[PDB]
Amino acid sequence: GPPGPPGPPGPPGARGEPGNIGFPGPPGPPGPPGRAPTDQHIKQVCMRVIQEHFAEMAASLKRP
Amino acid sequence: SGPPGPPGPPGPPGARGQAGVMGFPGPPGPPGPPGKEASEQRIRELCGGMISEQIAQLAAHLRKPL
Amino acid sequence: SGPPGPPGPPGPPGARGQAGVMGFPGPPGPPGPPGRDATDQHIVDVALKMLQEQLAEVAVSA
């Protein structure tokens, strides 16, 4: 009697490994610049200095 | 009266592995630059008159007669 | 002849699947910290100079 037919195909193979982690991101951008003084701030500091050295101004401006 | 046939063909390749996870964030950026200083000329222009008035008023006050 | 044989055994399992694809690139880091503000000292420096100059100019008139 004739031979039988070949079997069914084998089962699907094993699911592959997880892919690797992606590259790290680029460094963030630089921070914002520090603030520069406004005109009004500058005036306010000058007046402070005047007041803080008023004594020295008076000693210098003293008459005989 | 039949011999079993040969084994079947190889199965299909397995399913692809799961996609990888996103990379870590990058490092913090650099510090921003320091704040710009006002020039001497700008300060002199803004405060010249103030200093002069103050000196004027004070000199006047210290020469007063009662 | 006579009866045909039964179906043979299953084939072998196929190869392992390819590995997963590499993940997405990471996001940019966060901004750096802000730079330091300009201090008042550079203003004080000039104010004191101006004050000195003008006090001298005044004193000069003796």
Author numbering:
A (entry chain A): 3 to 66
B (entry chain C): 2 to 67
C (entry chain B): 2 to 63
The authors write:
Two host-guest collagen peptides (GPP)4-(GXY)4-(GPP)3, where (GXY)4 sequences are from the α1 and α2 chains of human type I collagen, were recombinantly linked to chains A, B and C (corresponding to α1, α2 and α3 in collagen nomenclature and omitted here to avoid confusion) of the NC2 domain in the following combinations designated as α1Aα1Bα1C (for short 111), α1Aα1Bα2C (112), α1Aα2Bα1C (121), α2Aα1Bα1C (211) and α2Aα2Bα2C (222). Three unique chains form a parallel α-helical right-handed bundle.
Whereas the crystal packing for 111sm and 211sm are similar (two trimers per asymmetric unit), it differs from that for 121nat or 121sm (one trimer per asymmetric unit). We suggest here to use a rule of BAC-translation: chain B is leading, A is middle, C is trailing. Despite the variations of composition (homo-trimeric for 111) and stagger (121 or 211) that might not represent a native stagger, the regions of sequences derived from type I collagen are well structured. Crystal structures of 111, 121 and 211 constructs demonstrated that a staggering order can be manipulated at least for short native collagenous sequences, meaning that such sequences are rather adaptive to various abnormal conformations.
